[PDB]
Amino acid sequence: EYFTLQIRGRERFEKIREYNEALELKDAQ
Amino acid sequence: EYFTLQIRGRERFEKIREYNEALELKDAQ
Numbered sequence: 001e002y003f004t005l006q007i008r009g010r011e012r013f014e015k016i017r018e019y020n021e022a023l024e025l026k027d028a029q
Numbered sequence: 030e031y032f033t034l035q036i037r038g039r040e041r042f043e044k045i046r047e048y049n050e051a052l053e054l055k056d057a058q
Binding site for chain 1: 031032033034035036037038039041042045048050051052054055056058
């Protein structure tokens, strides 16, 4: 395995999907 | 395994660390 940001729990991964939206914020403003 | 956001490549993981800073942007403004 190279590298991975683990989460642990269903809701946990999902939480990271929204966390990715926030990333977009930077790429935006 | 629950879930994980894989990357693939050293620089690749690192890139995601900066990607996490961008996340902070949302939690900020």
